[PDB]
Design a protein around this ligand. Structure first.
Ligand SMILES: Cc1cc2nc3c(=O)[nH]c(=O)nc-3n(C[C@H](O)[C@H](O)[C@H](O)COP(=O)(O)OP(=O)(O)OC[C@H]3O[C@@H](n4cnc5c(N)ncnc54)[C@H](O)[C@@H]3O)c2cc1C
Ligand SMILES: NCCc1ccc(O)c(O)c1
Length: 440
């Protein structure tokens, strides 16, 4: 009787949690596939992650699933010690990956500033605004001010030179997967807090360890535990929600009565669903504005074996590009993150060559691929990231619903919110507990 909308990680783990509690559920998924914004698929001669890729044992929810489904030793680190290239004042500078990481490390010290005062428990991100806050008034003032400041301006205001500004510009075009200048610096500070306030840990957690058997070994594992078949090709068109239950209408017009609805549809796709009554004004403002995830992820194949790292600031097609696989036919597959899905065609060899040409003139693209999540009706974004003001008046507002409609998904997590499968597994599970506790 609980209707779960979406068979991504949040919906899958919510279903398994309800099953443990003996609560009847049904998952309605719009696509002909499960996994959502995690999607492992054979492309260009090997399995590639069209979305979620990296994991770490400091991510509690992701790591427990890795252990559960047999993947404990099935992780491999991305290539390191690459030849680094970065664009700063319209020119390419070359150095070692260590050289680049040293410059980023110094910049992150200033970027994280305040995280120890804001986030003593890094899983209580809004503690500063709670009745339990006991620090000085100036800490709350700076906290609210930091929600209206982007992460690049912090580095500018600290007097770093143009090279470091261009490096963090590139870095946060990837990290905010969108225009970093519209973003909330509090997101970066909480990443620091969850990473022991050290750049190397933050990169170890978010950009190092890959699953040999893909995210699909995890989402297929969870679905394999479910005793109720997932209803694929069943998009939800309408949710009527009240204090004692809900009514869901599918695209085909099927009406399904529910004791509760767990909605995992991301903000970028919520406009496909009619809500009755309308969602609160403050939540609608977030949906209208959207998150700060307008960017895109590409996979590029070049001739030869090349250990390559490239950084480029806005408005480049791609801001962070790195070698990921050395193939048996003398080619290299690289990953890339960009700030603007509309400035690159992920499947155009000419655009992929333009990306590589940002740094080198001697590397030849032979293949390219990707899925433009922002142009995907059922996503409408990449990973969720925060605009100015959305740390304190954004993701947490989706919990302020009186009815039996519950919003779950990575974008509303307390921890590795938006950016990580960890946040989807966190919030899917805890939202199921909200439903369980209410029924108990
Ligand atoms: C490019 C990219 C790279 C990423 N890389 C990483 C990484 O390296 N590491 C990491 O930990 N995380 C990564 N992530 C984040 C991770 O993919 C997400 O945090 C997580 O997968 C989101 O899960 P979810 O269940 O909250 O949402 P989703 O996966 O979006 O699930 C929502 C589901 O609802 C379905 N749906 C939508 N609308 C409807 C409707 N009307 N009716 C029915 N069903 C509907 C969708 O098809 C989808 O299956 C990445 C994300 C992107 C976009
Ligand atoms: N999977 C992307 C997560 C990510 C992307 C870019 C960054 O610069 C970063 O620290 C983290």
């Amino acid at each position: 009787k609980v209707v779960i909308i979406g068979a991504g990680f949040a919906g899958l783990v919510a279903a398994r949690e309800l099953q443990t509690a003996g609560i009847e559920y049904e998952i309605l998924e719009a696509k002909d596939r499960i996994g959502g914004r995690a999607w492992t698929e054979e492309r260009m001669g090997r399995p590639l992650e069209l979305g979620a890729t990296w994991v770490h044992w400091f991510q509690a929810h992701t790591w427990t699933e890795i252990m559960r489904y047999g993947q404990r030793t099935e992780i491999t680190a991305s290539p390191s010690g690459n030849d680094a290239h970065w664009v700063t004042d319209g020119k390419v500078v070359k150095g070692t990956e260590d050289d680049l990481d040293e410059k980023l490390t110094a910049a992150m010290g200033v970027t994280y500033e305040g995280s120890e005062e804001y986030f003593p428990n890094p899983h209580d991100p809004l503690w500063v605004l709670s009745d339990d806050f006991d620090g000085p008034a100036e800490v709350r003032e700076r906290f609210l001010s930091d929600d209206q400041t982007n992460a690049i301006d912090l580095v500018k205001e600290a007097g770093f030179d143009q090279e470091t500004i261009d490096l963090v510009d590139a870095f946060w075009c990837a990290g905010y997967i969108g225009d970093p200048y519209t973003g909330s610096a509090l997101m970066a500070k909480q990443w620091g807090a969850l990473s022991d306030n050290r750049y190397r840990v933050m990169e170890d957690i978010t950009l190092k360890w890959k699953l040999n058997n893909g995210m699909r070994s995890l989402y297929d594992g969870i679905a394999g535990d479910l005793n109720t078949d997932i209803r694929l090709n069943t998009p939800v068109a309408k949710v009527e929600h009240h204090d004692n239950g809900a009514t869901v209408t599918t695209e085909s017009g099927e009406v399904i009565e529910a004791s509760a609805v767990i909605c995992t549809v991301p903000v970028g796709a919520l406009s496909n669903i009619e809500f009755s009554p309308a969602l609160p004004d403050a939540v609608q403002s977030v949906i209208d504005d959207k998150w700060n995830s307008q960017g895109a992820k590409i996979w590029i194949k070049i001739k030869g074996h090349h250990r390559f790292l490239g950084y480029a600031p806005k408005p480049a097609k791609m801001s962070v590009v790195r070698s990921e696989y050395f193939m048996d036919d003398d080619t290299t597959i690289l990953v890339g993150f960009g700030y603007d899905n509309t400035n690159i065609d992920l499947n155009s060899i000419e655009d992929a060559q333009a990306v590589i040409n940002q740094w080198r003139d001697d590397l030849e693209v032979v293949d390219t691929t990707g899925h433009n999540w922002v142009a995907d009706k059922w996503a409408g974004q990449a990973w969720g990231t925060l605009r100015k003001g959305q740390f304190t008046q954004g993701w947490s507002l989706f919990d302020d619903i009186d009815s039996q409609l519950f919003f779950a998904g990575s974008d509303y997590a307390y921890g590795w919110r938006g950016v990580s499968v960890d946040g989807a597994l966190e919030k899917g599970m805890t939202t199921a507990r909200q439903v369980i506790n209410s029924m108990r």
